[PDB]
Amino acid sequence: IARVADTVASGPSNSTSIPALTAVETGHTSQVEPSDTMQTRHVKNYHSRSESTVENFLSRSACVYIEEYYTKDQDNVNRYMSWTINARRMVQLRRKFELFTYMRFDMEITFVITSRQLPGTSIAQDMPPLTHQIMYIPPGGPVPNSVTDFAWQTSTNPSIFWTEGNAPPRMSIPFISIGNAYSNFYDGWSHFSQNGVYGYNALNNMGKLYARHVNKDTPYQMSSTIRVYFKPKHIRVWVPRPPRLSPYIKSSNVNFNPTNLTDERSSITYVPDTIRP
Amino acid sequence: IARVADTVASGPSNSTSIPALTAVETGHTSQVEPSDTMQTRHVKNYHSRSESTVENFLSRSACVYIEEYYTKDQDNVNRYMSWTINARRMVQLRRKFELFTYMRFDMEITFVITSRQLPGTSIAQDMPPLTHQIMYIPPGGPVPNSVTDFAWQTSTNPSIFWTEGNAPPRMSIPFISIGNAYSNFYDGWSHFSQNGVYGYNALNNMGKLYARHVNKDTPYQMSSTIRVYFKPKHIRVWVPRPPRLSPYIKSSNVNFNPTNLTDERSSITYVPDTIRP
Amino acid sequence: SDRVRSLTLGNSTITTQESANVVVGYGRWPEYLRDDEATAEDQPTQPDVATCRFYTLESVQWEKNSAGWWWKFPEALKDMGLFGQNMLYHYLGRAGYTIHVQCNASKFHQGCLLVVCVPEAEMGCSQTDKEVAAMNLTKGEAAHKFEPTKTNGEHTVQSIVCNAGMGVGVGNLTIYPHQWINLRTNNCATIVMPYVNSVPMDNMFRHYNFTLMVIPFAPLDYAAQASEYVPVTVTIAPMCAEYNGLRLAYQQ
Amino acid sequence: SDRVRSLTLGNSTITTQESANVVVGYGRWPEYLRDDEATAEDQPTQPDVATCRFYTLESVQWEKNSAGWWWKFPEALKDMGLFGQNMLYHYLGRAGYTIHVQCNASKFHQGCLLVVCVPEAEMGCSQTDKEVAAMNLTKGEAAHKFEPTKTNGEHTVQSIVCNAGMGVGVGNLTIYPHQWINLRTNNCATIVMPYVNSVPMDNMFRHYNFTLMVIPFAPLDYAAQASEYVPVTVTIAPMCAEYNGLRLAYQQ
Amino acid sequence: MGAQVSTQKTGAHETIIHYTNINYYKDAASNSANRQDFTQDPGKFTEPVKDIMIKTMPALN
Amino acid sequence: MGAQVSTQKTGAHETIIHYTNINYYKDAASNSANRQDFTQDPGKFTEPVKDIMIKTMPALN
Amino acid sequence: NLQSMDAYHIEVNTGNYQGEKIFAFQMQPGLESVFKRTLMGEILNYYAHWSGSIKLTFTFCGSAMATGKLLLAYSPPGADVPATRKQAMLGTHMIWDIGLQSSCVLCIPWISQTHYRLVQQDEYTSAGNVTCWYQTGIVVPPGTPNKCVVLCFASACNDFSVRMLRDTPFIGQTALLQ
């Protein structure tokens, strides 16, 4: 089905046919194959590009964020999580998405929440299972300012209640973008006067995500770390582009430091001698 | 279906037929049966070689590796696991696989992860359920150097997140080998100059497998032991060979110490008298 | 009479008047690589009669205390006519081979050899703590021999016969394509080995596809005035030899 | 455009953007020996792509005072890959050959070469009273050159160009398969030579089937600051190579 | 039910290889990935020329 | 669904013995083992001779 | 040149340069520093297995008056890298004649033992080397540069394919970006 091209058996040649000669100036990539520049044998190639599919390539859960929130109200420790959803803080997944200019797809979101008890001299407890609450707040919705804010009522905002021990919570979401496709790159501004925000943040706005412990309080300080995972499915991509070369500096723009095109070597004719009997 | 041959009823004989006489020099194994060298009765044999199938023989989860990793960063204890996948460190399964020269099959991998709390005078805790992460890194992928390395983002590498208490994590994998069949024995080298690596390690490269606790930290030192299990299915085997006689010494080669062909005994005519009224 | 047989490959012909049938690998006979199993896209070369012929190696002497011998192919044929030349100039190779071990005596001599072809005969080192050297695995048409006792060499192969240098029982080598040479009935042994490997083709210098072992289970013996010189000659002929990846000859 | 052409033999391919058609021997194209014309009863070997490929010889420099050069085949290819190996191991040989002489300059350079293939190019000695030595007739891929004046060597070839070392007129060499390389229009020359001999096959070391001569009729010239280095490279590829009489390699 | 049988990806025992699927959720976004869509058209990037170029011919003439 | 009924292995109450199976995953590697493939051909190892040898006859003659 | 356009420049000069190797490199589409970052190699690094042929297109950027013939050879694994043109010429080569047609393709056929190769190529899955030489030389008229640039392009053929999904080793971080 997604099979690869076979190699036709070719023999000697001596004509005005010039498949090897061309002109890249046309912007046309040569469509030559081994059988065109040598004598080849017939080969029934059964290989398949099934795993090169944009679907199989991007459809794999990848971490996009991670924050920690405590249970007790001691010191200036955040007791809840806040996050302006986006996939530009994790270089791995961010680099893949940026292989294309525009994207369209549904998505499977999985959460890996783990807790712990902070070190201490006398910390003997017996706390029941910790239950967490993850609430999604689309742009404009009321934001909670405490682990007891009325906003956690989740009247209409989607929210998940998960208790430790059980399988990591998950749920799918459609294609939210108000545009016909998500934009990984936006060479424009937010204001017509050509100023303000520049790039991604200028238009993308998937809202925010908040988390917290629904448990009232813990005898001794404890903390939990939530890890968000994205897995696009039913994918569509447009306009491919040069992969990221320079390391990512900011998660709001494409700033970078002049990076080398590639690793170095002795000379253009350098090739390590691996045959030494 | 996989039934065994029945025994035809045979009677007296006196001819030039010599089924008992032969010549092993031909390399031919005698196809004689009881009915050929004596008087036998008809017997409808219903026995079946259903459990002698290469499938039923090798399709059974067998431990192939085991390592321990701690939670706290105290002393020089490894907080994560690393492993160059292969089944040559566990004599049991290794000996079976080595009954054949080449193998081809898919495989079911199961993980048995267990934790514990190291001894101490004052170790009263209350740690929530421990969540683990097993990540497979095919040859070439970036390797993590800490329990907080970016590599654990699992952007495209297959990874599993499991919390203690639940059933041991499992997942199937196809036929990875770049060859048409896995090779248990390679009487060759890695370099054309006939040097470097010799044998298995010269060509097999299934990548590496890493594990760790996704939990930030534990009040007191704790450790976990992960046990990897392999269960080949949809099996195919070629070129059978003499079972391992000498004990396994190294997991990288077939080195051995001159071992006895078998146990000894009084004399060639020694047979214990078990009948003593 | 099935005792007499004749073999003809290329410009070579072998004769026998005391053979014991012919073992054909694992039931298969040498054949060229098919299109639905090929990988190398370049059109292979098939010298045919040029390389597919009988090549006789250095004879060996069978003595009352001989423990055995072994050869590794196709390496052992690196200097044999054009078959060796194609090994040098090509990256990939594929061949069949027709092993024919000769060894005659008399109705007054006695002994029994075990001619076997062991695919991927990975061998161990004398010193289990060290590794082996190619030089000790195979040395051209020069045969390496098994010892009735343990070896000690630094990077030598554990030549102790009982383990066949593989950490197994010699009595179980019968699971490989083989034949015996029971002097009282035989005179030679022939084995037609088909290309056996987990890959369509492979390098012929870096990889030793199979090892030919001649281990005597019945010690050579005889009375006084009876010819004490009993040589064992090995002849092998490649079959369906194909080559790919033509380039500058490899410097041995 | 018939100017551009491509040649493909084995794992080799030549390209041209300024050729002048292709001369095909005496109207014939290389072909294997037929059964009704064969003599050697043994089945021949046909390496095909292994020997029938483009072999490039040592380049030569064309100078304002160059008188010419010449090569003798198949001798000149005695050390070329497997084609040379078959010459050593076989008593009889037969091949076609596709001569392709390259030589580029610029629209500002001028000169005209004469690429010719002379069958049985028996040559004379400098000293008419003595004989010639094989060493002076052909020396591997190393080209012998013609001189604008008479030679004196003991057993040297009368390199004086005007007589082409054959006692004839150079202007009449056009009667042999040839082409010219007029820099103002050309860039190379190709000639497909069919097996020409009074015998179905012949030895390839003892007999020099044909001689390739590159004689300039229009002296290379140019102005100042114009590349003074104008090399002339010769590439040849055997066609329908057959071999008979396999035996121990011949010691050169 | 609204079962839909498809073909599975080749196994390590080739040369009953089909699976069944039923959607339980009302939103298409809930369905599993489309790992079996094998469409291709490199022309967009490899040959985006206005005039078809025949391999065996000169790019310019 | 794409159900496939096969025969079960004899029980301890012999002399409805069939089971049903449906593949849920898209990859053949996900399917269960093939514990019911009973093929045989010892000839490869027991009789790899070029000339058929009849039991009731002399190996050599 | 790790940060200049000279990294792509493959100079060729007029005058005698016989026996001189214009350039050379291994055939590691995803490991070789030369290909490691090209569109092709950049993608292979997201996979562990690869297979197929490769198209190495060479374009002469000299003047319209410059002429010449180069020998583009490819030698499969097994022997030492071609030290002379004769050695290189014995392998799969392409004699490129510079003319109106600026570019010339040197298709490297897939001549491997196994069906696939590791992107993280080792000696076992070696692919060979590619060496370029002067078939003849670069002749030029008066009042014309003597040094010319030759660009190299690399891409996969219709028989190419990747297989083992993995993470690319060309991107990482030490902490969440902000």
Ligand SMILES: CCCCCCCCCCCC(=O)O
């Ligand atoms: C209920 C949780 C909603 C989370 C919305 C995530 C949307 C991700 C969009 C990614 C856009 C992009 O990568 O260009």
Ligand SMILES: CCCCCCCCCCCC(=O)O
């Ligand atoms: C996702 C985990 C991948 C693990 C790959 C294991 C491959 C095992 C191959 C065994 C090869 C052999 O036994 O000869």
